[PDB]
Design an enzyme around this catalytic site. Structure first.
Site, PDB file in Angstrom:
ATOM      1  N   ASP B  11       2.932  -4.334 -10.733  1.00  0.00           N
ATOM      2  CA  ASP B  11       2.461  -3.153 -10.011  1.00  0.00           C
ATOM      3  C   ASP B  11       3.175  -1.937 -10.589  1.00  0.00           C
ATOM      4  OD1 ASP B  11       0.801  -1.708  -8.009  1.00  0.00           O
ATOM      5  OD2 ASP B  11       2.769  -1.081  -7.307  1.00  0.00           O
ATOM      6  N   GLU B  13       3.405   2.469 -10.356  1.00  0.00           N
ATOM      7  CA  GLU B  13       3.218   3.675  -9.589  1.00  0.00           C
ATOM      8  C   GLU B  13       3.370   4.748 -10.654  1.00  0.00           C
ATOM      9  OE1 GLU B  13       2.383   1.492  -6.175  1.00  0.00           O
ATOM     10  OE2 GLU B  13       2.065   3.635  -6.562  1.00  0.00           O
ATOM     11  N   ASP B 111      -3.365  -0.477 -14.279  1.00  0.00           N
ATOM     12  CA  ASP B 111      -1.974  -0.680 -14.692  1.00  0.00           C
ATOM     13  C   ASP B 111      -1.958  -1.035 -16.197  1.00  0.00           C
ATOM     14  OD1 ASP B 111      -0.408  -1.501 -11.617  1.00  0.00           O
ATOM     15  OD2 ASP B 111      -2.602  -1.422 -11.845  1.00  0.00           O
ATOM     16  N   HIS B 158       3.612   2.552  -1.104  1.00  0.00           N
ATOM     17  CA  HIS B 158       3.472   2.427  -2.553  1.00  0.00           C
ATOM     18  C   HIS B 158       4.822   2.247  -3.290  1.00  0.00           C
ATOM     19  CE1 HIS B 158      -0.895   3.212  -2.750  1.00  0.00           C
ATOM     20  NE2 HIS B 158      -0.653   3.755  -1.553  1.00  0.00           N
TER      21      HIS B 158
HETATM   22 MG   LIG Z   1      -0.963  -0.301  -8.223  1.00  0.00          MG
HETATM   23 ZN   LIG Z   2       0.829   1.243  -5.110  1.00  0.00          ZN
END
Ligand SMILES: [Mg+2]
Ligand SMILES: [Zn+2]
EC number: 3.1.15.-
Lengths: 148, 180
Positions: B11, B13, B111, B158
């Site tokens: 993940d 950001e 991503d 997030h």
């Molecule tokens: Mg994401």
């Molecule tokens: Zn996120």
């Protein structure tokens, strides 16, 4: 409802996978409903480096505007994440009409291969429009064979 | 076989969705086996990016990254992109054979766009294919509307580590309820 759950199936052929230097050679598009029944077939265009890129984007954007609501339906296909990278760059107004999510058939193939190896062994082109039809049949095959 | 069937969960950001301008500000990595069993937690790094870029972010970006404590943790960071890439590449090489394991997560193609540009050596360790949990989410909505309502709401702010654990929880939920 049913309309927001439609799918925008695509298949693209490029010179390679380098987004900075490679180009879109061929493209095809068609709409299905939530249950993979083909509602309409879009064009099968060969792009120059036969038609130009900006015109294909108008042709494809017109086709989906009359078939789907704005920003609701996802892009669908085999390895469509590779196709989305090129559509986000070279056809941004076409991508503006779709959702950011994809229905990637190769994600389902990777899960079938791991979790259902026997089904995977018996899992089932000249145009990009034929490659879409093959991906739908592959997705339909996973729905019947590995989903509850 | 089994080591090649492991999944590389990630993940990111970022400062926004513009690949030409925006940069990676947070990254987390996690490894599962073929059946989504938890194998190993990887680094969880906040990457240092300029104050110009952070102040010129979107109104969504400034508010969500501000309240989460990320924009404050980015300004204080001493981790460069090159330093984080090295830590992420090292970790996946210790966990998986080269070029055989996929990238996994929700709409993880976004991503991958940022990782292809800003961490190309980390992407060279992974296979071409991805496991996009959001493909399965879209098929669940359509083909299993009842089970789709029973899925738990994404409760995470997030933060890469919290987001990655929920994508795993979400794919496990689908395996447990909509698969044969
Ligand atoms: Mg994401
Ligand atoms: Zn996120």
């Amino acid at each position: 409802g049913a309309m927001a759950q439609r799918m925008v199936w695509v298949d693209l052929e490029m010179t390679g996978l380098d987004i900075e230097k490679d180009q879109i050679i061929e493209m095809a598009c068609l709409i299905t409903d939530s249950d993979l029944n083909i509602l309409a077939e879009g064009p099968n265009l060969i792009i120059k480096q036969t038609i130009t890129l900006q015109q294909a984007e108008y042709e494809f954007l017109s086709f989906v505007r009359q078939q789907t609501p704005p920003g609701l339906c996802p892009l669908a296909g085999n390895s469509v994440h590779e196709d989305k990278k090129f559509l986000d760059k070279y056809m941004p107004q076409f991508m503006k009409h779709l959702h950011y999510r994809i229905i990637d058939v190769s994600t389902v193939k990777e899960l079938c291969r791991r979790w259902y190896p026997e089904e995977y062994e018996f899992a089932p082109s000249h145009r990009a429009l034929d490659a879409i039809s093959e991906s739908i049949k592959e997705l339909q095959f996973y729905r019947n064979n590995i989903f509850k």
